[PDB]
Paper text:
A library of known aspartic protease inhibitors was screened to identify compounds that inhibit plasmepsin V from Plasmodium vivax.
Modifications to the P1 biaryl region of the IPF scaffold differentially modulated inhibition of both plasmepsin V and X. Notably, analogs with potent plasmepsin X inhibitory activity successfully blocked the growth of Plasmodium falciparum in vitro.
Author numbering: 44 to 240, 272 to 474
The structure:
Amino acid sequence: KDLLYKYKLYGDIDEYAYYFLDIDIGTPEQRISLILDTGSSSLSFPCAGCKNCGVHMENPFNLNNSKTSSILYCENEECPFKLNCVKGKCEYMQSYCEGSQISGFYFSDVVSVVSYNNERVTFRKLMGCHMHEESLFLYQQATGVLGMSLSKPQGIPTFVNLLFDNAPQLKQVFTICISENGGELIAGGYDPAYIVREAEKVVWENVTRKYYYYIKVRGLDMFGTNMMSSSKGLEMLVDSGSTFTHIPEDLYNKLNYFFDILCIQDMNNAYDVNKRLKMTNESFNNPLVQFDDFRKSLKSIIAKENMCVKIVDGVQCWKYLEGLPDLFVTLSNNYKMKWQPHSYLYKKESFWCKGIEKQVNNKPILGLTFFKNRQVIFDIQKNRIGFVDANCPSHPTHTR
Ligand SMILES: CN1C(=N)N[C@@]2(c3cc(F)ccc3F)CN(c3ncccc3-c3ccccc3Cl)C[C@H]2C1=O
Ligand SMILES: *[C@@H]1O[C@H](CO)[C@@H](O)[C@H](O)[C@H]1NC(C)=O
Ligand SMILES: *[C@@H]1O[C@H](CO)[C@@H](O)[C@H](O)[C@H]1NC(C)=O
C-alpha cells in the first residue's frame, strides 16, 4: 500500500550467473547495464579508451561524450576519501578471484534510474572507470557493477543512499525478487501481491553488522538433522552478486554426502542402486533424525526415475524437482525457514543442478540460489532483512 518503484531485472543462474538492470548515465543519457550486487558499494564499468576491456552488451562509457562528466583529478597529490593519486588521477582499483585486478580512475556524472511506470530519479554519483579488466570481467555480457550496500561515515556516497535521498516519497526499503529468468528490484517496500497464498507472512531477521548485509545462521538441517557443527551464529552475507550460496566445507561435505546418495546416474545399474539401498541409520557417522524422510526421498527418486547427471566439480543435476528434500536454515529463536529445491537448484539445460558451493576464504554467502523465488526485503531503517516466498515477475532478456 506504499508507493513502489519497480525496475526490471535480467539474467539467470546458468547463462549469465547474475542479474542486471539498465541505468542511464551522462548527459545525454548513455544506457549501461549493471550487475545488481548487494555485496559491494561501488558503481564501475569500462570507459572509452580502455586498452584491455571485455566485449560487453554496451560500449565503454564515453566521458568526452557526456557534457556533465567530471574526472576526479588529484590537486597537490591528495585525493578525497583516502584514495590514491596515480598518474594525476584518483585511482579506482579492485581485486577479485586470485589476484585479478581491474584498475582505473574515479569520475563523477549524472545517473538516472527510471521505473517501468516512467518515474525518474536523478543524481550525481562517484563512479570508477575500468581502464583494465581481468579474468571473469573479460567474459560477462553485463557492462558493469551496481553496488547496493550502504554508505559508511565519511565514505563515497553509494547508489542506494543517493537513490533514497533523492526520492523522499519512498520508504527506505528495497526488495529483490529474482525468478529462474530475470526478476524485479522494488524501491519503497515490497509487493504483497507477489507473496504466495491469503498472502503469507514475512520472516524478519536483524542484521549483525551496520552498513553491511550480514545475518546470523545458527543451523542448517537436512532430514531434521543439523549439519552445522556449531549452533553459534554464522555470519552470512546476503549477497545478490554471488551466483551460488557458499558454506563452510564441513557443512558442505555433510550435505553433498546425502545429495551424492540421491544422485543415481543409471537406474538400472545394480551396483549403484544396491550400494544405496544397503544403507542404514548406523552407517552415516551422522544419524538422520528423520531417516525415514531420507528413505522417502531415495525410494521416490528411484520410483519416478529422477535420474541425475554429475557435471564439473561433481555437481549433481536432477531431471525433476520432485523428491529432493527441503532444507531449513535456523534464524533467531528456533525459527526454521524452509529452503525449497526450486531455490537451491537452478535450471541448467533441462536439469536441476545443485547451487550450493563451498565457501572461499571463510566467506559464507547467501547467494542468488537463496534469493530465487523469494522476495528479499532490505529494511534499511530498521536494520532487518526480510524473506517471503513469492511469485517473482519473470523477464526473458528478449524484452529489454
Ligand atoms: C560475490 N561477489 C560480489 N558480491 N561482487 C563481485 C562480482 C559480482 C558479480 F556478479 C560478477 C563479478 C563480480 F566481481 C564484485 N566484488 C566486489 N566486492 C567488493 C567490493 C568491490 C567489488 C567489485 C565491484 C566492481 C567491480 C569489481 C569488483 Cl571486484 C566481489 C565480486 C564477488 O565475488
Ligand atoms: C532486533 O532489533 C530491534 C531494534 O534494535 C530490537 O529491539 C530487537 O530486540 C532485535 N531482535 C533480535 C532478535 O535481535
Ligand atoms: C536414527 O538415529 C537418530 C539418532 O540416534 C534417531 O533420532 C532416529 O530416530 C533414528 N532413526 C531410525 C529410523 O532409526
